[PDB]
């Protein structure tokens, strides 16, 4: 039969509970992301002060860096050489950093950016990178760019700390609805409509039907990036968890 | 019956509820602290790699360091000289880092430590410092210690993000009861018995005589230091909110 009698009050408590999850995780996410950008910028400044390869290796090979990012690499405009923090890393024999998304985004913007999701050269896996240009301290000339890789699997884990008891999940999308981080990596870098049905962001908690079932969906902006933290919650389970 | 039992329940809930607040904050807090410790270790490793004063200044004068810590200074064992990140800082005409607690604590521990509260030489204010020793990379000899100053006021501000709807406040203490951080800086460095009445730490929630009056008080350990986060809330106002 149908879902039966449902308190117009309890389903506003759910509506607000959802708003609260997204708003809070979005603050949390902005802080963690800001933290990692700050570490990237510091390393980059140290490198600019003296970009000798041995100095670069020292700066990027410390535990803090190796623990904060998947991989770090500084590509040179001059010859497409690179200095990186993982001797096991092989992006391929003819790889030129100068053509890559992290490199071009940092060059094009002349400042620190985080890339849209893109396919890793070595593994093909989708990730993002913090990326920064490196300028000649004397002349201001562009010398190359540095990437700092960020695991989307790990971002997904981070935003799903919140305890939802299989009632729903948290994810991250960009302003245009491209998925930044989903519990199912298969969606990373794809339109959020692939799992939500809807393609456009509507921040206010609202009902969405997915395979015939009602879900409460809400979003909240992330300060510092054109990103939103989103949540999708089985409305029936949510209502039921509460009712009781 | 309906009164005794109901009251016992609300009191058991108000207990738990309060234990919860500080269990959370003791996790948030360790997160922040471990973050600041990792930055200090990072900068120290880079300094040990090349402790020439110009390189030291470059490392400790970047915005990440300037925004993470109140002040940073490397005190030298050879002559008591120092390299610091604020040319306007002046600890006085007869200051020697080698008799200061941050310096000795790091020299003795032979690794990274945080100090107990102490009085800042320049300003008199009560603070703590992350402190690290510096070794000559060629001979292993002790070269000096570095301090990275932590604002206790700002720490109080942090633990008090928590919305207590003005019914109480959060604070930090060390094992022996010494106040690490209190919303009123006058208590920093003092026995907690001064604002609680209680001189000894009891983690599980409980009632406390202060102005011959009842507030709820719980402690949760902080992972990584011999510290505890603590809370005090109005039991009357507490009870009322869990009751309704």
Numbering used by the authors:
A (entry chain A), B (entry chain B): 53 to 296
Article sentences:
Extracellular signals are sensed by methyl-accepting chemotaxis proteins (MCPs), also known as chemoreceptors. Indeed, we found that Mlp37, the closest homolog of Mlp24, serves as a chemoreceptor for taurine as well as serine, arginine and other amino acids. We determined the crystal structures of the ligand-binding domain of Mlp37 in complex with l-serine and taurine to reveal the molecular mechanism enabling Mlp37 to accommodate these structurally distinct ligands, l-serine and taurine. The ligand complex structures and the mutational analyses demonstrate that only one of the two potential ligand-binding pockets (the membrane-distal pocket I) is involved in ligand binding by Mlp37.
